[PDB]
Amino acid sequence: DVTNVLLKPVLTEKVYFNQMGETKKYVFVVNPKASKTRVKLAFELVYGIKPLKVNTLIRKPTTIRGGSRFPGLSKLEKLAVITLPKGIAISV
Amino acid sequence: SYINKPGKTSAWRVMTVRQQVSAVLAYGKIETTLKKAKNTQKRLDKLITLAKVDNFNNRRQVKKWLLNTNLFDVDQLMDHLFSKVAPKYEKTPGGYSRVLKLGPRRGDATEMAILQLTD
Amino acid sequence: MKRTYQPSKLKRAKTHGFLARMATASGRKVLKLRRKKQRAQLTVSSE
Amino acid sequence: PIKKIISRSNSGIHHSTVIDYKKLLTTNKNKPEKSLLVTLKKHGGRNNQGKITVRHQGGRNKRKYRIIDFKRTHYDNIEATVKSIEYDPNRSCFVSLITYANGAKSYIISPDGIKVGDKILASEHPIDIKPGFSMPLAFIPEGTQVHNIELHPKGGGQIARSAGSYARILGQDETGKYVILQLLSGETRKFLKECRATVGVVSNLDHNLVVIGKAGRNRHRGIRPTVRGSAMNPNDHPHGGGEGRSPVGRDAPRTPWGKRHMGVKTRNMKKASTNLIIRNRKGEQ
RNA sequence: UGAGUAACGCUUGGGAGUGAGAAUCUCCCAAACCGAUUGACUAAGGUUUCCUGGACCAGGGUCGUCCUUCCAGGGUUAGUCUGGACCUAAGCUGAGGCUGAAAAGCGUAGGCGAUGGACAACAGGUUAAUAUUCCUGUACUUACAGUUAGACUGAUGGAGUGACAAAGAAGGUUUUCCACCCCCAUAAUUGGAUUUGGGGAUAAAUCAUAAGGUGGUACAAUAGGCAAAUCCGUUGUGCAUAACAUUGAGUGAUGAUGUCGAGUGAAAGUAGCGAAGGUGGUAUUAAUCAUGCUUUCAAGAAAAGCUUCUAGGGUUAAUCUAGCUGUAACCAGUACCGAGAACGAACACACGUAGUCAAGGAGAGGAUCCUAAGGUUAGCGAGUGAACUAUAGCCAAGGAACUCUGCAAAUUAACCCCGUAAGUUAGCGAGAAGGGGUGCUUAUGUAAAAGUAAGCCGCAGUGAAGAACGAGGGGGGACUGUUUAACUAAAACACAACUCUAUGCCAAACCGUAAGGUGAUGUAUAUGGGGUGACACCUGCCCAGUGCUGGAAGGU
RNA sequence: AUGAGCAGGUUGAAGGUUGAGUAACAUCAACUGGAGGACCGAACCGACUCUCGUUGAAACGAUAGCGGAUGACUUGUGAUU
């Protein structure tokens, strides 16, 4: 852990649907170079909480702004979604 | 003359007029092309005249020109016809319905005719 | 109809790869002068 | 022996035959023992350069090399018993599996007449002669069918090891060296006596009686179909190209290369063995 | 400018609403096609095109409230799936290393290299975007460390394994099929009537039975496998009569009181609910046994991985097995389009585009006509239906009078039954020739039918569908075939076959400059060259000259 | 090198088996049999005929077809000139 790989959590409608369940699934944008071993480590050391399960994906960059006068490219980000034990969660 | 829309012959106009008479029997109003309205008025008048004998022969006969929908079945149409439509229009020697000329469409700016029947 | 070029991106990488073009001295010199040629794309990876 | 091919095909007529493979062989089903077989790769007509470097050859069906003893000196004075006669699709003959009495099975080249179960022995010492014996030339008298001769001693028999090939001794050089041999194809040399030999004739002698039949069967057996030189492109070959069967105009015609190569021998006139020239395929010295 | 000339690039009509305004936006209704697809899987390909909401300013072959158009936000989760971590096939690179003015070329150890191999999961659930990934339930593997007991382990090297073609055959096995049973719904207004349709079960995983297959089971000497060997081997003996080992369908028990269901259907047809969850065979079917089996020759993969023996050693247990416990199983992928408005094709076009299930009547069919779910009216429409034209359907009669000509067009067809010659390399011809038949009711007919008989019918009976046209003479080549991509398809080319020629091994020849390699891991019965070019009988002459070869004096 | 596929229904030669039969042959009867640069023929390949397109659906094809169609196989992946 570099104490920076836990970049930021996001709360979208699908994330709201995930968190309104029971296992309290949350999502963190993280550095795409770390393995789930040290990611889970960083998680049980930032709090007293170990993740119940982990899953990883990346938001693939696309041509952002589409066809326009000033198009561009979208950002690179890896989302790690964590399920926690049912009765416990994290107060961000 | 390879694959394309090939145009339409008697079969398509027959199915079109059958669909249109079923639709007008559903409500009592059609807005369509003037030519098809002129074609359909004859069959409509004959059908109104043909169902006044009310036997199984006439049942099959006047059934042979009806199509289906959800609000009305072809069985529903023949029942409605035989039940109420035939006895009312017996008081005229022809000219059951009226086909009136509307304005042009916005799709093709062509003459649209409204066919209706009231009593 | 089948055409002359196929979008096989792996065969594309084999045919016109950067590591393929740095394995040849002619390719290395071409990429050097293309750095001097103001080109944005030098190879497929440097597009 | 052979037998006429029965196909009852209605596309032309086939006048071809095929060898029985049973009265001369065994196990006419390709699944032999896994003892001494190594997979082979053909060159597809190409060199190591990637360029095609053989003429009208390509399309051979895949065949596996049988590991055959050639030096025949590692196992000496150990008695061998013929255990099988297995076909060799690479060479023009059928190899024989034998078992040296110490317990060592091995593939060898099968001389004509040997059968499964025959008892023979081969070494580097003067002994009697039975079919299959291999023993150096210095202890053998003239007048015997000998094949698998070794120009480089201790290397392995190379000359006259095709279908039904052998050589006959036409004497010994009176200086105690260079036994005189009649090589096949009419050549006659004074070959080194330092070398070994395999007695008798080699099996599978019916390659003088093989039938090729059609094009694609040979293509699968190897050689590709192609045109003569005198119908090639007018630059690649001036005699071909155009209308009217332009025939060959060059007396002693050439190749794509300007080879005046009719009747002329291309054997080296100044090799170290050129003093050992006796007969070249037509005449003397 | 042409010029409003052409065109607007595979398929509707009506009702209702939205919206100021709608063929093209939506709901509904129907249609008719595809239906071995016009149904879904995914490789690869495109990589946000995927989803929601708002909106229609630049494109929509007009329109466009809408679009796959723009704007804002958002969607793809993997100890067992695919793949890195397992490795190799061709192949590539390749230090050092060989050759070459140099750059460089070549090349070994090796390291890279799947389209293959080693290898542990299945099902239901649920979103606006996915899901062996997420959840639910039912399981599996893999070490790690400790513990319980047993227990000797043994590679670097040796042995085995993996390890394998095509073609073909008949069975095991349960499905399939059908009869019939259960259950559910169904009860008929037209003449007639007590009708009609559908469903009927479950995975991984564990256990048991394992059909059957595959074809040897132990004793010892080792002179063989760099060694060492208890492993292959080698030798016969005992059995060689059936054990022995391997394998192996299926079937059953759970799993599985679970999903689920005919169908019912409240706020939407959503949720809930959800009955039945049965037998006999089968001369129809594939599937699995099965790397099974039979045959042929052009003779049909490796490494990984597995087992094993000895070295290697340990034998205060290093160490192995399994129980139990704990720990943990990493890297990457996951949307959709996906035969096509998201591939290519510049393309909103109709084209070629991996594999694969691919249902019914019905048939040998994956052929054909009509259908089950599916999805929609091929990004321009609407009218009259001129000449002229594309497409057809047809023309009474002659019928080849048309032509350079039966060019083109048009009779034959599917199935069943009679009969077929010349020539013939005995295989064909041949569906030669030449004729007949195809329906229904009853009975007979095998297992159902064929088939037969009687009757009846049609204008005729594969009644719709799609179905080789023959005969002879001639030229060439035998043939089957390659063949001038986007003009010619051949009688060109090829081919078997043949004469001659050269190449004797470090073979010649070829490539490079060379090493060197193919040739070739070939060995004259092999290869090359040159030409001839089914089969058959022959190929006659001429060496003046050129040439080919050979020779040795003489001149040179 | 690596692979996938070749609907369909076809023929019964060879081989082998049994028997008659011959001193043995030979000869034939029947049986298994399933070989085929074999058959037609779905797919498929090619472009041989016809028509259309003749500034197209197409920088070149679309119809009916034709021939071939378990091999002088096709096709896919990778290498390779």
DSSP per-residue letters across A27-43: EEEE-TT--HHHHHHHH
Two structure tokens written together for B37 = 């309205």
- DSSP-derived letter for residue B83 is I
For B14, the domain range is 1-119
Distance between CA B22 and CA B73 in Å, rounded? 9
For C20, the domain range is 1-47
In chain D, positions 41-80 with C-beta closer than 7 Å to nucleic chain F are 41-42, 46, 50-51, 59, 62
Chains contacting chain A through 3 or more C-beta pairs under 8 A: none
- Nucleotide lying nearest to D10, CA to C1' measure: F38
CA dihedral (B35, B40, B43, B48) in degrees, to 10, reads -140
Cβ(D95)–Cβ(D66) below 8 Å: yes
Residue D177: C-alpha distances to residues D73, D150, D169 (Å): 22, 15, 13
Contacts (Cβ under 8 Å, ≥6 apart) of B4: none
Listing from the earlier edge strand, what are the strands of the sheet with B98-104?
A: B29-33, B111-116, B98-104
- DSSP-derived letter for residue D211 is -
Contacts (Cβ under 8 Å, ≥6 apart) of D58: D42, D44, D45, D52, D222, D224
Distance B38 CA to E504 C1' (A): 104
Distance A32 CA to E125 C1' (A): 32
Distance D162 CA to F75 C1' (A): 39
DSSP H helical ranges for chain B: 10-26, 34-50, 56-63, 74-80, 86-88
Chains contacting chain D through 3 or more C-beta pairs under 8 A: none
B48-83 b/e (C-beta count within 10 Å ≥ 16 → b)? bebbeeeeeebeeebeebbbeeeebeeeebbeebbe
Distance D37 CA to E306 C1' (A): 22
Distance between CA D46 and CA D172 in Å, rounded? 43
In chain D, positions 176-215 with C-beta closer than 7 Å to nucleic chain F are 214-215
- Nucleotide lying nearest to D13, CA to C1' measure: E479
Distance between CA D219 and CA B108 in Å, rounded? 70
Helix/strand/coil for A9: strand
Orientation of helix B10-26 relative to helix B34-50, angle to 10°: 70
**E strand or H helix at D94:** strand D94-100
In the block, which residue shows the tokens 């006439």?
Answer: B58
- Nucleotide lying nearest to D102, CA to C1' measure: E223
In chain D, positions 225-244 with C-beta closer than 7 Å to nucleic chain E are 225-231, 237, 239
Distance A75 CA to E119 C1' (A): 38
In the block, which residue shows the tokens 């190409």?
Answer: D46
Q: Is the CB of D205 under 7 A from strand E?
A: yes
Experimental approach: cryo-EM
- Please list the residues that pair with D134 across neighbouring strands: D198
**Which resolution in angstroms does this entry have?**
9.5
Distance D66 CA to E246 C1' (A): 30
Cβ(D217)–Cβ(D164) below 8 Å: no
Distance between CA A6 and CA A34 in Å, rounded? 11
* Total structural domains within chain C: 1
Q: Is the CB of D154 under 7 A from strand F?
A: no
Main-chain dihedrals φ then ψ at residue D255, nearest 5 degrees? -110, 180
Orientation of helix B34-50 relative to helix B56-63, angle to 10°: 170
